[PDB]
Amino acid sequence: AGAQDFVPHTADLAELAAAAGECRGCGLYRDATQAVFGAGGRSARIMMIGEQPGDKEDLAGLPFVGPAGRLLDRALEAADIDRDALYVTNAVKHFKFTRAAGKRRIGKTPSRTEVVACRPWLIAEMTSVEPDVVVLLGATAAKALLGNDFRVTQHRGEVLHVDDVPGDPALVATVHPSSLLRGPKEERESAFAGLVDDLRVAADVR
Ligand code: SF4
């Protein structure tokens, strides 16, 4: 189902990434510029998963390059997180979007079907990196591993462990960094410190 037959039998991230460029596991490859695979090395101890590449990522060919990526980088700073320790990816690897009437590309939420279709890449990445801890950045990513009914709001910052996940890594669900780019300054400050806390929990896993 989905991307399964497009995934090669290798843990090599370069080769996985190249194969993802050829994926037709759902419809999203058609309109997107290219696949945006994860970034980092198989030595990474912390895997971070967002929803999908955004406008800038789709064209940069790298995850977390936009304003959300800047904000996340500021949080890793405050959490004493070393980028050498990070593998960062997204639950789906092709940007799903529409053009706004007023010409910037606006991301659209991946359907559960698209998440499940792309999940074999995520499993391949998880099997390749063998992380100690996986940070789920927002509801789409968290549901991809924790179930379609999972609520980030009720469990954020808790160390979770599900038996059906490769290598039984610890799992920490947190807010989507994009959500912290909007709202009252004092609320964004509180949300940022909560993200930092969730990141410190993950970094303190072992
Ligand atoms: S979003 Fe994922 S499953 Fe769908 S075509 Fe792209 S790489 Fe394949």
Author numbering: 2 to 103, 105 to 208
Q: From the publication, what sentences describe this entry?
A:
UdgX excises uracil from uracil-containing DNA to concurrently form a covalent bond with the resulting AP-DNA. Structurally, UdgX is highly similar to family-4 UDGs (F4-UDGs). However, UdgX is unique in possessing a flexible R-loop (105KRRIH109). Our earlier studies allowed us to propose a reaction mechanism of UdgX, which involves the formation of a covalent bond between H109 of UdgX with the C1′ position of the target deoxyribose sugar concurrently with the uracil excision from this site in DNA.
